[PDB]
């Protein structure tokens, strides 16, 4: 695997989104990975619906939070429409999938990255973007304006995000707080510190879609 990976220089990442007030980060995170794998397999970059996971994953708690792994199973069993067909509302409605016609994409399952393992995360990112969680509740995280973020933060992971690259000293994260946060919506979190949690808990639970 190479020293730098940035899926944006491969055209596999869509613009930065803003989830709003709704605790819909789990849905945001999942759709990053799905836009990623479908580009990698088909050579096309598409935007998919966070609002359909919001409404339709039963497992997760709508605007109160939820699970990128439940969302990514829903897309493996059923599929997902495009974003322009089932646009973001930032409120949980009921599941409208059956109304919006046949799914635009379906994936073939979901895998877990082995947790607490920087190298297994780096090797997964070198393959495609990955859904990751971290502790975002801290002020230092919220106030982040750019540079390689080192904390402070703990590991009471609370927020799902997508890892779309890495370098020698960082992992490159697409967040869902719009472009005025961070580096135009992105954060570079420090890696290689030897905290098996990863900085802010980054190594706690990572999942990626499987598409043949």
UniProtKB/Swiss-Prot annotation:
Active-site feature positions:
25, 159, 175
Q: Does the keyword Hydrolase apply?
A: yes
Give TM regions.
none
The name this protein goes by in its record: Papain
> Using the chain's own numbering, where are the disulfide bonds?
22-63, 56-95, 153-200
Q: Which keywords does the record carry? A: Allergen, Disulfide bond, Hydrolase, Protease, Signal, Thiol protease, Zymogen
Where is leupeptin bound in this sequence?
25
Question: Listed GO molecular functions?
Answer: cysteine-type peptidase activity; serpin family protein binding
Report the function annotation for this chain: Cysteine proteinase with a high level of diversity in substrate specificity, an amino acid bearing a large hydrophobic side chain at the P2 position is preferred.
GO BP annotations of the record are:
proteolysis
Q: How does pH shape activity?
A: Optimum pH is 4.
* Keyword Hydrolase attached: yes
Q: How does activity depend on temperature?
A: Optimum temperature is 50 degrees Celsius. Unstable upon 65 degrees Celsius.
Q: Per the similarity annotation, which family is this?
A: Belongs to the peptidase C1 family.
How the protein is activated or inhibited is described as: Repressed by the active-site-directed cysteine protease inhibitor E64 (L-trans-epoxysuccinyl-leucylamide-(4-guanido)-butane) produced by Aspergillus japonicus. Inhibited by the inhibitor of cysteine proteases from Trypanosoma brucei (TbICP, rhodesain) and Colocasia esculenta cv. Kaohsiung no. 1 (CeCPI, tarocystatin). Repressed by leupeptin, a peptidic cysteine, serine and threonine protease inhibitor.
Quickly give the catalysed reaction. Answer: Hydrolysis of proteins with broad specificity for peptide bonds, but preference for an amino acid bearing a large hydrophobic side chain at the P2 position. Does not accept Val in P1'
Q: Which parts of the sequence bind E64?
A: 25
The protein's Enzyme Commission number: 3.4.22.2
